[PDB]
Amino acid sequence: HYVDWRMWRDVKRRKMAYEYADERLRINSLRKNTILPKILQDVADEEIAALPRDSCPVRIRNRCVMTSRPRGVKRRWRLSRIVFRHLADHGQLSGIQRATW
Amino acid sequence: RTNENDPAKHGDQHEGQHYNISPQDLETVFPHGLPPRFVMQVKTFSEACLMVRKPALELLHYLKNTSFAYPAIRYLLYGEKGTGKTLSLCHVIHFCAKQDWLILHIPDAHLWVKNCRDLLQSSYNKQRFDQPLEASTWLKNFKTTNERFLNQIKVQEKYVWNKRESTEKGSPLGEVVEQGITRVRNATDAVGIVLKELKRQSSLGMFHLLVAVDGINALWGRTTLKREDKSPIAPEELALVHNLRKMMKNDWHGGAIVSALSQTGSLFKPRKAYLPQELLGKEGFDALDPFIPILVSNYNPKEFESCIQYYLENNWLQHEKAPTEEGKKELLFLSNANPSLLERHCAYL
Amino acid sequence: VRNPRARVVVLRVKLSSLNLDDHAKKKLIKLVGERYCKTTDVLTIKTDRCPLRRQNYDYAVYLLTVLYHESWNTEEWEKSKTEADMEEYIWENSSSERNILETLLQMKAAEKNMEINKEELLGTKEIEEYKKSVVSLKNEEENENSISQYKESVKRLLNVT
Amino acid sequence: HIFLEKHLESFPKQGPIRHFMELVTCGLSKNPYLSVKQKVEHIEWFRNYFNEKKDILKESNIQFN
């Protein structure tokens, strides 16, 4: 029942990345050192590449939790600028007020 | 203003009063090392009057009571920037020249550790670098300062320059000086030979030596000269600095190592660094130890009034308000009686 | 109620309180490094590696224990303490002492009287004041007063006044 | 939580693998968010991975197991 298909894709990607975070962490740790043999590093590289694409953490997009806007999303509140402005103007966000100085 | 112009007789009675230098003495003793602004002032006024100050007087007392038998003593002039350390050293240099010493004058050791376009490799020691341009400049200046002693003093070794050219024992030091000057590539080697010969022969009573080094702190500091591979160079690699360090050791006798710290022109030092340790570092302070530090402080009110009167009589202070007591007070405040600040202010005032 | 910052525990102790000798104190200072504020004479250990506050507290106490015991302990390589590895300047066997000794030897040789030796020269009060001034300049902050004291000492030693 | 050396006894006592596992253990000890079980899981996974890849290690002259 997510906002849109793009949000659904993002949710699936987040689930998968969380699921495979540990294995990616370990394999990337193997790849990211100058100590181990380079042959071992190469096999680690091919393996990490062989992991499913959607598990890549970078593929996660921080969309607005409410309207699925892919840009202009404040991380602290996870709300697009439009929705954040709506709520703040209606005074529904604690401690947020129009700035003047 | 003193009728006393002999640099030995004047003392505390002359403290705070001027001391004149004749044009011939200025040309001979001081072909270099005088502050650029003082050189300009002399050019403008046609006269060279240095106020007699307690630091110079005390250094003169020490040099008059110096026992040439004892190992050469190190005197170190230190003080806030623009306190007149360089000109006090020049005053003592003139006194020594009139007493007929041999003045080994380093106008500024800072120049020898920075901004060198021509930095070759020493032929005598392949691990050391040459500074031929500055070496030749200083050699010319030293020749001018000490021509009269130059011929009289003899060498005591065989000094090869090329695979075929050399200087033979008993040759006058003027031969070495001429070789260094005319042949720029051999300037560093000539400077080293000159320093070594003077240091050895001073212990033999052939003369009284005065090693007067301005900006002595440079020798044991850092240098802004980078190798061909952009590698930083430490001072010891520079033969000139190495030989000068050798000279700066009290191991010999028959002379005095007078030197002045000078933060101006220093490298990797804060602006306010003026104390001996602050300006020398561990290595420099240990090398100079033991030494006699002499403090050069800003003008006391009497000296300040004397300098203001000197400028007024020369007519330098053109501002119509300069002669007034209010103008004098304003100058005193804006300069805190500092010699350099007062001179710069009066320049445009 | 969880709060990640809640797990940090700080342990502050004045080294004066710890029963440490001179060598142990110096070794402990070198080991701790910036964790020791000399201005306040306070060693601070901030532990946040363990998840729990109790675990971090236990680890901080353990770190204090191990640091103290190793500081009192001694190791073979310690004997190779170069001058560049000391923070308290020691005039003894120092460059300044060697230089002043050589100067005194030169002065007395010029006097031609071989009534001299290391102990004889170093026993005089003049050397005592000179070394006091040199140590003060080297360790304590330098100023006009200290420089003047050093000047007087050097003048007295060199017999020039 | 901190002293994880006791878990490395299965790995070679010296060599590139030992150095790498020392780094890994240092990181795990500094990590506060993971449980002791999770840290042990990481180390055991590394052990199993190297055991399986032993052939490559021996061909490359790194002794293991």
Place this chain on the structure above:
Amino acid sequence: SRYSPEFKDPLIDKEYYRKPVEELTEEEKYVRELKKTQLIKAAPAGKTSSVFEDPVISKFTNMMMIGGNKVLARSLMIQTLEAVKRKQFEKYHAASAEEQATIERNPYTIFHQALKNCEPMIGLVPILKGGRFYQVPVPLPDRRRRFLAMKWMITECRDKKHQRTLMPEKLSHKLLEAFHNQGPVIKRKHDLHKMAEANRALAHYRWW
């Protein structure tokens, strides 16, 4: 303007504040009494009661400034004054006693006189009669005259014709030329006057 309209510009003159109370006219005493109960701005960082303070040189330094580098501008100004004074002293000493009477060595006086010489008396302003603007000659206020003198001097110095010549020397040389009523600045002033005289026929196009 952070200063409200009530605030008045400070007056900085020790002589004015030390003037005897008896010498004050009714209006002057009233002015002092009014200022006793008035708001005054803070003394600007550019001026002080220093007897050596020169407003003309202060304004010249401000005009010479580039990007708020008051330090560099003041340094250039003092270097120019020192160079002028040194040149005058050299000429004085090298000159015979008779002409030494005329040779002047006060750099401030030289600067003031050079600027006064360079001041253009009559300017060219666009005046529109019937919908067409023409460059009518016109009298200028003293403020505009002084500003034009200073601006011409500074622009002439900044020109690129003098290459590898430091601003102190450039400005000292040009100031001496102007003092002796020669040089490109005086030439420019004469050119402006010549253009005005040529366009004298359009003077009536002015209405004020």
Place this chain on the structure above:
Amino acid sequence: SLSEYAFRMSRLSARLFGEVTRPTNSKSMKVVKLFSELPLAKKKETYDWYP
């Protein structure tokens, strides 16, 4: 580089404080920093981003 005494004391301090005892370059310290923190994916702010 460094005096032997100071280097040995630094290694001892690292051992006491639980840091890497062996010499190591930054390329390999990457491993330490990786394992010292939760992966971005594991962070609750990430995997629980959406309500």
Place this chain on the structure above:
RNA sequence: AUGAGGUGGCAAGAAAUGGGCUACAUUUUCUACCCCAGAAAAACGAUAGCCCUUAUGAAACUUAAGGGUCGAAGGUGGAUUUAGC
């Protein structure tokens, strides 16, 4: 299937034009210092190009940083036009 999913791929310059950054230097450039210095000065001038390394990333010729390499156009700019009390 104008819906959903997967792989790959475009996102370039003939050329014009808008805004900004860099400069055309001597009130400049480098060094030290943060304002009393020493050198440079036909050199000034790229954040452009090419090569290498590194950071992040699974993926870097194409993203960013650093270094090396090259020292290019340019020499205060037309009418016109922007901002500032």
